[PDB]
Symmetry: D3
Subunit: 117 residues, 6 copies
Amino acid sequence: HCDLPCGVYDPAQARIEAESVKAIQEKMAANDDLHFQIRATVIKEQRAELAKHHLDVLWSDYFKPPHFESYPELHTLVNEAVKALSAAKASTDPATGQKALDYIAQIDKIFWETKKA
Amino acid sequence: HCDLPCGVYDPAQARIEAESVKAIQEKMAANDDLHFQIRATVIKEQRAELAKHHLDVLWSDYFKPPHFESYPELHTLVNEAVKALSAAKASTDPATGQKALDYIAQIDKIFWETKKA
Amino acid sequence: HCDLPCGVYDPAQARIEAESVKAIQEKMAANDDLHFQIRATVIKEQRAELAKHHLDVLWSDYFKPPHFESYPELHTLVNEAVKALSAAKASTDPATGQKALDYIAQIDKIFWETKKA
Amino acid sequence: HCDLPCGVYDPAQARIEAESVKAIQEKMAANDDLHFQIRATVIKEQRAELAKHHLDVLWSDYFKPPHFESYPELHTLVNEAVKALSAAKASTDPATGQKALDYIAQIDKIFWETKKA
Amino acid sequence: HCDLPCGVYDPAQARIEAESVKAIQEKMAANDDLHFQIRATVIKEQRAELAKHHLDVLWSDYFKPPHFESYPELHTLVNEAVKALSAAKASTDPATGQKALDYIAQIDKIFWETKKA
Amino acid sequence: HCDLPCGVYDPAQARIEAESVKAIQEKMAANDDLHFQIRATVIKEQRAELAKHHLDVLWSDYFKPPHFESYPELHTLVNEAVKALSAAKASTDPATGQKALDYIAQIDKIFWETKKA
Ligand code: NI
Ligand code: NI
Ligand code: NI
Ligand code: NI
Ligand code: NI
Ligand code: NI
């Protein structure tokens, strides 16, 4: 995932950051303090960006032509996953964080399927 | 390109970094000094990574579903472009840097076409 | 611009980021939502910092000693430009973003003049 | 792990990066090409640094005073783990990468115990 | 402090960033303007993170086993310092920035004593 | 130095990084091992870049118009200092690192004079 390439990848990197995004959104509903809201927004932006980066890496580095041929919907899936993360950056609604997590889980399943083969 | 969204995008960001990548490869071919080779490798790696990031941003943030519908080859094209940059990272052959630039030029053409419609 | 040196520079890098700064300030006037204001401030800060970095690179790496002699106002011009960007960070007024862009335009003019020389 | 706090942590972040470190070392032992050795060293340095950062975060943010009281050797364990990663940066021997992974596994076990407490 | 190792370390790096954190909190006490509070929070978060990083480096790289033996409270002291910085990120009260600086001063004293032996 | 502004500046930040640059150059002069040379080069590049950044910040943020008028040679001094750091990146000769340090000492002197004024 370092582009050497090292041969080591794991969608869990994207998932953990996406989990933080959702967890922060959940916390934003229980504390309306201004400074907490500011910090929560700032940090959510950072974690969502990292999640997007991790997905971009799977798409650009790990997945190869044979994979896109076997999974014709993969390009759209990853593109929708990163767009969902952008939507989560602009929202305090945990549902947006959840949507990103759901797409990531779909990508994770495909990832491990290509690893077994 | 900052995901606000700010509405400001330009494939030029990717092109300039890719131009540096090819320029560095040309210099590496002419100077075999060990330390220069090390520094050139380090810097080329960094600029190619930035170029990949800029392309990933166009793909994830700027291009929308209607665009991928109008240009069914777009997903593949951007994926080829970033893979070409990965190839350039692992090469001192200016031809690899040029291949990345060729794809970026095709992406740039499509980008501006979407600005006309 | 990578300090190898690679021989590749373009004020366009600083300009695109400064354009995002102004675009963000304009958007901040059309949406008083708290979270949008927070995100816009966060992102504007990041893009302005990148713009300053790009100008710093032109100043320290591209422009050579003779250039500052041929253009006696150059040091002051770049310094005023980065300070204008610092001012844009602390303001939601698009006029501050524009002021930075005006200075960048003057730097861009000198840049190309030295390129053709 | 973002210091909000978000309540989301997983030693898996450190483990995956350490796995890349060892994987890179295995590749370095087989391919003596100068340019590959350069890139491998550059990238191994980066991934090892990320692994150290992830461990530092668990130590500074996740683990609380009661945890260090319950597991008196935890400070030493994490310190040994990060030092093992520094050693891996300076080595091409996969054994050094494995040593870091062994320490991380010890930390992972204590981590999950505190989670269940 | 770069992990080469270079042999150059100074707690001053951590101290200067922590001084910025407290200085920012002091400025936040004087102005309730929304955008200033947002910018101050964003920047304070960044400087506190750098301060934690510098301390983590002293802990992981500079201090060796003999040092932890000679100063049994060192592990706890550094951990308290970084935790104090996390607390400063979440506060506008200069007292939190001061608490972090006090711990850093204690670490600084031990650091220079170890440079004596 | 964070552009808030926070009012906290110290040339020590630039100096400590420049000291690492020279220290690394001296260590390179004593160990011709390939991998050590690679790591030393990679790390020297990073610390020199940080040193340049710190000087750029003093020039763009701390120093104001009155300072440049009182010290007509200040612009050129900082510019030559950063250029000296670029030269240090491209060299293994400790003399280049020392040249950078001598310029920083001159900037440090001026800095503190303006602080007492
Ligand atoms: Ni990798
Ligand atoms: Ni943008
Ligand atoms: Ni360059
Ligand atoms: Ni977190
Ligand atoms: Ni160091
Ligand atoms: Ni500051």
